[PDB]
């Protein structure tokens, strides 16, 4: 069959579209963030960690990939928590 001829390149595959796969959009977020987190010095006001602190604590989960919430609620949640924090 296929498996006993062409298995062996990897010890554990995963399903198409799951979060844990290296082509998932989570993997693209992580890979992009690794390079992006350094474009400015820490002290600059344009530093990403300063500009969007919650993004750095974002969980990578199937939950955050599947649930299609409204964006405007997320913009309200972000401005609101910044105001209550300040």
């Amino acid at each position: 069959g296929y498996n006993n001829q062409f298995s062996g390149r990897a010890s554990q595959y995963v399903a198409p579209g799951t979060v844990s796969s290296m082509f998932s959009p989570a993997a693209y977020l992580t890979e992009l963030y690794r390079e992006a987190r350094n474009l400015h010095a820490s002290d600059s006001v344009y530093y990403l960690d300063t500009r969007r602190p919650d993004l750095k604590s974002m969980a990578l989960s199937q939950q955050n990939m599947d649930i299609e919430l409204s964006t405007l609620s997320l913009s309200n949640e972000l401005l609101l928590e910044s105001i209550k924090t300040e």
């Binding site: 069959g1 296929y2 498996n3 006993n4 001829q5 062409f6 062996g8 390149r9 990897a10 554990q12 595959y13 995963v14 399903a15 198409p16 799951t18 979060v19 844990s20 796969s21 290296m22 082509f23 998932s24 959009p25 989570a26 993997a27 693209y28 977020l29 992580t30 890979e31 992009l32 963030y33 690794r34 390079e35 987190r37 350094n38 474009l39 400015h40 010095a41 600059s44 344009y46 993004l55 750095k56 604590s57 974002m58 969980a59 990578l60 989960s61």
Partner: protein, 671 residues
Amino acid sequence: ENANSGVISRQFFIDWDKYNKRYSTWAGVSQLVYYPENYIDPTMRIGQTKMMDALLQSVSQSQLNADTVEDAFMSYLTSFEQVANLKVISAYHDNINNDQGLTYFIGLSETDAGEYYWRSVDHSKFNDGKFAANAWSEWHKIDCPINPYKSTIRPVIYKSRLYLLWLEQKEITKQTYQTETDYRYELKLAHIRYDGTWNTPITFDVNKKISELKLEKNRAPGLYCAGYQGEDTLLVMFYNQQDTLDSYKNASMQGLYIFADMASKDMCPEQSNVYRDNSYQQFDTNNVRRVNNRYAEDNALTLHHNENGAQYMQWQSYRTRLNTLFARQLVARATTGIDTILSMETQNIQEPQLGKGFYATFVIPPYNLSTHGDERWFKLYIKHVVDNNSHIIYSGQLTDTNINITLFIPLDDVPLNQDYHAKVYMTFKKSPSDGTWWGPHFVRDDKGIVTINPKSILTHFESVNVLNNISSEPMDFSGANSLYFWELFYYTPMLVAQRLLHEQNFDEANRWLKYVWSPSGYIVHGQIQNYQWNVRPLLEDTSWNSDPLDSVDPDAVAQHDPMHYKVSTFMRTLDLLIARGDHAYRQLERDTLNEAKMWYMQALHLLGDKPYLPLSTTWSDPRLDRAADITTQNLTDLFLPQINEVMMNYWQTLAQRVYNLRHNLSIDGQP
């Protein structure tokens, strides 16, 4: 305001605009690197040979029949044979030092008004004693007219552009009233243009300079061509032929200067003496033809034409085949047609050996950490009693199994030691240092039989055997002609099968695709054959490399690891079976739907058991802050590889199609 200029210079942001800015492009690039078989299309390929481009457009039409495709293949084979029989004349080495640079070859086809082809090879890509297959370039036809005297043509590189000098000779008459004859000689220079056409040859009068050379009758003057470092001048020198370099030390060097505008000047004798005493090692004696370097102010590369017909280049222990006598042996196989050309016993046609030497088989001991160490690398080194440095001849990783390695071991022309003629020794992480007797020493007698010196110690070889009865080796799918051999044995059947699929000539497509691989097996002379795949490099490469090639071309990466080509053929067999089932299913009568079912069931057991994939695993929903550091330890460190989405799709469509055949729907699922 100001991004960190160091961070922007990273490769990730140079590739930004092309691949990484859009998620879909990034995913496509990453799968095209990791899963080449999805994006391999036999119709178009980078680096396609000109005769395969003749083939594709010749076979591209609405109606394909057995005779049409057979004739298209016989015309392809004619082109291939013509480009394989040609022999090299001369070469030039582009760089002052032999380690780097390029080497340009000139080759003549066996025809009366000869056609001349130029080929280039790369020394940088050469390593571990074997030229990489991609280093070699395909032959290119030379368009300008060439009519040299005694095949006195010599390429040269000037200002990084290719130039050709060849000496033409013509015959003219003298009055003495008795009538008499004599010759005149015209050196001609041409060069290539950016579009690969050739500029018109410019004549240079050399009659004085040749007449100063008291040539023997029907002897070609020694012509030396070299491009000067720094000054943009072509050095062209004429020298009298001599049997030894020791004689060139005082040869009366004729020559002339040639400048970028193709003006010329003569040499002063004083300049010629200097250019001589520097370059004389490069002069081709009557016995052997040397390769020129760029001029300078550890033997040269060399071309030997062996008596058995092997042409081989030499510059160290290293020897390399240039031409292949495959096409001259193929005619017997071709007399019985296509089914015999492609067969496995064509691919084992023998190549004559190159140079003087012997064959030896080395059996590599198993992995054994106490005699091995942690690093699994090992290197085979040769040494010759010239007592130069050693040279690497093979490099590999120690397996737990043995490895059987059969090597051609060069032997020098002259036995500069009486007790042994070569030393081979085995080096590895645990014991990288060599020992005086700690490898097989080989010696040859007068009758030419090679034997292992009993004084030598074989303890860390599992076995060494000398195959004294063997004077040939298998056709080489990694040598110079590797591109043409992959062009014929594998690409051509797959291209033909692909074209026949679109024309719905399934019966002819099945046999054409069956040439490369057949699950039923192969029968020869009335006996069933053990092998399953008809192509030797697919049969021999049985598992992927420890790492792939990182390259955004699917075909070079599949060429580096031909286990991928096996999947591409498998997937084209499934494409054929599904299309045949759909075609039968299009007729809704009772009998035909049972043919549709047996076609789908046939592809079903080939695919086999659909893999089960545990829905949740070790992956733990980490913080993005953590995944960034886990991945940046210098993504597979934390993200797992997915199963090929196309192979998954074959199981989805086959199961749904059989579901309709079982439930009496149609193919669009309507009752």
